[PDB]
Symmetry: C2
Subunit: 829 residues, 2 copies
């Protein structure tokens, strides 16, 4: 009586005649597009009790109340959701009552009940009792609440019979239709269910039951239904099916297929009989009782219902995402594209093996198939005419296949036929022959010395570098004077340069719209003097790298054609000290401890270089006499919520700013007629960090960070980029080192004298004398100069009596320690 | 004492020595970047009275009062503005009071006094009396208001001396500095001026004068100053110089230059001595007394300070926008660009002549130089080495220069050289020799059959179209079965197709990233059977365009290469009825008058056709009996609160596609294997027509077709349909005859009347209005009720006389009320 898989019904009522025996539809259910409205309440299915997956009702004409059609539908499990909902009521023509009065809970998903024509009573449904995470319930599009006439038994006239429940301060009746209420199981059950007239159900139960505390009496189980009993976990030797039941291996090979089905046969793993084994695991043959781990990324079969999965764009490769092996092939006909590779390395860069051919056709912007990294082997079962199991035709600007210095590839059951790729030189393919076990499998015309790399150029020689001068933003190099078979042939020398620090960059990574655009060319002609060799002076080269160099010539091929030799030199990697270095960046340092200072910086951005060694010059800086000569005792998707506009006139602003700047330039042109401490050095070795110690506790230090690199010797050092930092004051050095002395003076005056700190931190700015008779309220200031002149200070016109005093020093770092109590007295006479 | 042009000073006080004799600085003034702050109020310039243009002060250290430096500055004309503004005080280091106490008016532009550390006394400067359009002023960023200490004589302690003026409900004192107030001419003086002690000046005056109503006493008058006298208009034989004065033609020609100067010599136009004559007019030689109209676009010289304006991007084409003749030479080196042409037709499509070379170096994406349209002639004075005054090297994807069918191009003083165009067919250049008269000016190697079009390739033959089958949204075609010197050569036959109705299209408009990307290639090869000639069946055609197709031969070049012939067939234009037709769009109509109805529609987007003539079938429609059998008597946008822009739109796309495929498989497996005639009036060429001789108020059906050029052979297209109602017959709804009344028992009255002869649409009901004194009672009679009885009955009426009226309810609207019906009912 377990109907499955999910049932579909549309365009007629008679299709409901397939629901007499359905109690738990093991799947989803669709009752949709019933536009006839021919029949009425003659189809009744009390047997239906649960839908494992979501339910979809749509355009069901002639239907007024679902509860009549599908009663006893105790619970919807909703293991699979439509979008995220376990029930769909879309554009319901004439439903008045939601019904489902026996429906009690929804395990997974929300509901969409919108834009119906005559539905209400949704307000009377307290989904909180039925549904968890109800905030996703989407019922906005229905009738305004005013008109539908929310009433039902109890809340109309007759004695109330619906229970009273509260949501968000709404303690009122809950119900489903005009004929019945919405009861909920008492808190006496807690999470447990119950039956009519408040008889509470078994713990392992849900929806409803027939007898109190009986496993076999439950209408719907809570988690898993087996052997006519609801159980909390899957009994041993039995293995969970999808959703709501346990079951033993035998069928799990036997559930072969029925219309919509895959296996044939379901495998058991992790204690459950799933459709296919999870990731990182492999089904060993037709076994279904367990599943063994594979090892690597094997568990992904990329198969598609088609045979030749043809690709023509990035959007064409989305389906193949994160997949390794296909029972098929490739076919590209891209006729335009920018940054396409960076996408295809991601979508299908994981493809690893193919059972057939790999075909490339009429692709312009394809430059070098290095953008498909993981292909290792090709079987060739799915072959072309003539058993060509690896094809590339009319690939205009193709440059070269996957890197072949370290990577390997194999073709098992076929050959390859490259044609009409004038930029696919024969050197890249003469290596393919020896590697994929196909050297003699085919003839040479299949690897024709024609169109293959045709404009990939006769047979190029090498231009010999005569010398390599260099500079600090300006490479140089010179090379052999080119002498063709006929001197009139050659016309110039296109001189390449890009920044390839890492030797893994070949002459064909980025050339010009053929190989992409990375090697930013520039050219210069041979001098008219045949006695002066072709030598050039690049410039404008950003710092940091082997802005490499190599020489080809833009030459003339005709009449003799193949006899026209052309030339291409080797890929030299002139370096820095060719682009000789420069100055620092990002200078910083701090004082963690006294007589210590951590200095750190970063690899500077324009040192025209690569790391050799770093130097910082730190010099003690003066404590300015300006501070000494001052008496401080008396001295005293963003904001566009209110975006005004998006100025496409930024270009007009550009021109206006250019006009202003040029006006200021000519303005400048014509306004004026023709017009104590040593340096300490500690080179770092290779890092931009170092530490400085043996420093006075509270001295201000200047920190000259340099790019004194490998060529600091020849070309002198770089500039000295600088920063200054202070040290951490010596704790306890600010306290007064000696006792205070007091002497009497006339006019009831007292003179106070004391010593000065031996090692003040920075400088002593002032002294704060605190004194008084009973409480030291009086506070007066003494400057360092005032202290020097008198060795202290004077207090005049003090009242008779005894006194206690204290003194504090104000260091440049902060306040000092208070002096010990000073006891003195003044007599009236 | 008329210093000019504009004066500028910086970086030192000693440059202020250049203002002792300057009374009216005939230009702008810069006193900026004085960071020294060396001196103080020792430089005094009472003479300075007016600045013709804006005044800029910036970074003038050590200055606390501008009024001391530049007193008597009565008015600033501000003819030329800084940005839109006649005064800019930017980051004034220490200025305290603006001074300018003698300044009275600003003619053009506004002021910019912002972010000054120590500036004050702007709140008391009521710019309205000085300035027009005070709204744009911006003084938020300066010294904020709270401590500004805006006080001045009178408003502090002592007896008030500043006058009271009101702006936006603030009638209080105005002033300049702590020592002086803000005085202005009274309402007695009006727009017109005055001096101290309120002695009102002359009419043609401004700022200030010396004596009341005297031409020669004005300190700085209103509009124009000449011969020591102000005048309202520039006197005859004298010509207005820029801004504030007139000058005889002799001076207008004598002003050669002084450092910053253009003419050398100024020309006279419209009564004013201008730097250059305005647009559309030309200075005949060196004449300055007058300027004569030229004719066309001559008056715009494109000359640049540089000699070889090198072109490297669209941003490199802006400066020469809207320019016709360059006296130099131009170099394209764009290494990448999309839609660049469309831009350079506007930026540089107007250049016509050049006195020098045109050179193209290292341009990958340049495809056909047709986009530089206006270039007609090249003089060539500015030449390269070897007299190459028209040069092209390393244009990778060049296809074709300016269309040489109707376009002429000329070079006067040099030859031309083109190399490293692998895609420049020699047929594009062989005609150049005969157009610019340069056939012999250069050797054959100069326009060599070498590099020029090297992959413009060998030489193309032409195929024969054996037959041309065609279809209705889809093509077919065949051509001759070519036999090369060696059969193994050919590997496929290229099959282009685009939509080129206007026969002005060559194969090289947009081919593929070489010529741009327009001819959307797709290819099919020869069939295995040599007895079956190459045939093909394309698809994907958009309707209504005199379509385009052609073929070439894609060949293999080696061993002999040049002998590998290839081929190119003619650019055929398979057409409509080859792209056989389709069905209509955009049908509408309305009723302007009875028995008339205007019908209009649109030439469909899918006619697949040539306009030949349109057909409309209109049919009278029945009036539904449903209505008859019913008794009606009783019946920068939303982003002010923008939530987000879903970059997850791709994920939404996948979810939607998943749902659609789900529904597709769901559809697959749900079900196991399962009163009037037509009238026609063909339009001729337009999509409009009229239909007449129609019943006044009958609803019509309007079938509009694409029954077009070849509706003959393949029958008509679909018949796209709409309805439309006519205007009701005015006056046909009125009752045609009188009403009759009869007595009935129970004080009842029976009313009978005739029916409209030609009701408009249908008579739904009758509204009888009756009463004794006032016809208050209103009752309804249905059409069926009237038919059964010929009227209606009224029962239980009170005794007395009565008057009644009746109205009919037509489908178009209410009818006309009946004439008064007089009747009476007796109690017994």
């Amino acid at each position: 009586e377990i109907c499955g898989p999910g049932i579909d019904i549309r365009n007629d009522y008679q299709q409901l005649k397939r629901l007499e025996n359905c109690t738990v539809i093991e799947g989803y259910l669709h009752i949709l597009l019933i536009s006839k409205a021919e029949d009425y309440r003659s189809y009744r299915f009390p047997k239906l009790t649960v839908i494992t997956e979501y339910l979809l009702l749509f355009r069901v004409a002639g239907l007024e109340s679902l509860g009549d059609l599908f009663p006893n539908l105790t619970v919807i499990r909703g293991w699979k959701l439509f979008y995220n909902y376990a029930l769909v009521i879309f554009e319901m023509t004439n439903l008045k009552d939601i019904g489902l009065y026996n429906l009690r809970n929804i395990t997974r998903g929300a509901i969409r009940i919108e834009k119906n024509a005559d539905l209400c009573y949704l307000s009377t449904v307290d989904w909180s009792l039925i549904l968890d995470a109800v905030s996703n319930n989407y019922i906005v599009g229905n009738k305004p609440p005013k008109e539908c006439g929310d009433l039902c038994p109890g809340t109309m006239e007759e004695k109330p019979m619906c229970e009273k429940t509260t949501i968000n301060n709404e303690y009122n009746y809950r119900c489903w239709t005009t004929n019945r209420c919405q009861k909920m199981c008492p808190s006496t059950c807690g999470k447990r269910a119950c039956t009519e007239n408040n008889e509470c159900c078994h713990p392992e139960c849900l929806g409803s039951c027939s007898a109190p505390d009986n496993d076999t009496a439950c209408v719907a189980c809570r988690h898993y239904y087996y052997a006519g009993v609801c159980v909390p976990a899957c009994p041993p030797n039995t293995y969970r099916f999808e959703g709501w039941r346990c079951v033993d291996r035998d069928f799990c090979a036997n559930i072969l297929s029925a219309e919509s089905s895959d296996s044939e046969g379901f495998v058991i793993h992790d204690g459950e009989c799933m459709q296919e084994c999870p990731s990182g695991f492999i089904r060993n043959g037709s076994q279904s009782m367990y599943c063994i781990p594979c090892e690597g990324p094997c568990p992904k079969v990329c198969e598609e219902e088609k045979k030749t999965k043809t690709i023509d764009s990035v959007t064409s490769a989305q389906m193949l995402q994160g997949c390794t092996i296909f029972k098929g092939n490739l076919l590209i006909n891209i006729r335009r594209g920018n940054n396409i590779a960076s996408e295809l390395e991601n979508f299908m860069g994981l493809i690893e093996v193919v059972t057939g051919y790999v075909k490339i056709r009429h692709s312009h912007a394809l430059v070098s198939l290095s953008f498909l990294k993981n292909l290792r082997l090709i079987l060739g079962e799915e072959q072309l005419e003539g058993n060509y199991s690896f094809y590339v035709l009319d690939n205009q600007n193709l440059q070269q296949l996957w890197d072949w210095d370290h990577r390997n590839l194999t073709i098992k059951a076929g050959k390859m036929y490259f044609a009409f790729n004038p930029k696919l030189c024969v050197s890249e393919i003469y290596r393919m022959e020896e590697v994929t076990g196909t050297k003699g499998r085919q003839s040479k015309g299949d690897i024709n010395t024609r169109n293959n790399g045709e404009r990939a150029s006769c047979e190029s020689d090498v231009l010999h570098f005569t010398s390599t001068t260099t500079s600090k933003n300006r490479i140089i190099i010179t090379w052999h004077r080119y002498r063709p078979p006929d001197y009139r042939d050659l016309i110039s020398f296109t001189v390449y340069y890009k920044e390839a620090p890492f030797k893994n960059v070949t002459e064909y990574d980025g050339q010009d719209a053929c190989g992409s655009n990375s090697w930013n060319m520039v050219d210069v002609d041979l001098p008219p003097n045949k006695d002066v060799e072709p030598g050039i002076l690049l410039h404008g080269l950003k710092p940091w790298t082997q802005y490499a160099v190599y020489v080809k010539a833009v030459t003339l091929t005709m009449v003799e054609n193949d006899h026209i030799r052309g030339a291409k030199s080797e890929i030299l990697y002139i370096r820095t000290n060719a682009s000789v270095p420069s100055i620092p960046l990002d200078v910083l340092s701090a004082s963690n401890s006294s007589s210590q200072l951590i200095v750190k910086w970063n690899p500077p951005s324009l040192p025209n270089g690569n790391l050799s060694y770093y130097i910082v010059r730190w010099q003690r800086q003066p404590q300015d006499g300006y501070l000494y000569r001052h008496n401080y005792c008396s001295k005293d998707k963003g904001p566009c919520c209110a975006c005004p506009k998006t100025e496409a006139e930024k270009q007009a602003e550009k021109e206006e700013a250019e006009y202003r700047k040029v006006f200021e330039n000519f303005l400048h042109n014509s306004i004026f007629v023709p017009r104590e401490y040593p340096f300490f050095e500690s080179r770092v070795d290779n890092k931009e960090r170092t530490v400085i110690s043996n420093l006075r506790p509270f001295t201000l230090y200047r920190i000259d960070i340099h790019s004194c690199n490998h060529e600091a010797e020849k070309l002198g050092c770089s500039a000295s980029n600088f920063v200054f930092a202070r040290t951490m004051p010596a704790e306890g050095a600010d306290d007064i080192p000696g006792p205070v002395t007091w002497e009497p003076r006339p006019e009831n005056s007292i003179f106070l004298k004391w010593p000065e700190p031996e090692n003040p931190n920075g400088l002593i700015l002032m002294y704060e004398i605190k004194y008084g008779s009973q409480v030291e309220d009086q506070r007066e200031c003494v400057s360092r100069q005032e202290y020097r002149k008198y060795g202290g200070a004077k207090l005049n016109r003090l009242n008779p009596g005894n006194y206690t005093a204290r003194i504090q020093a104000t260091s440049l770092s902060g306040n000092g320690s208070w002096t010990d109590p000073v006891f003195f007295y003044v007599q009236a006479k």
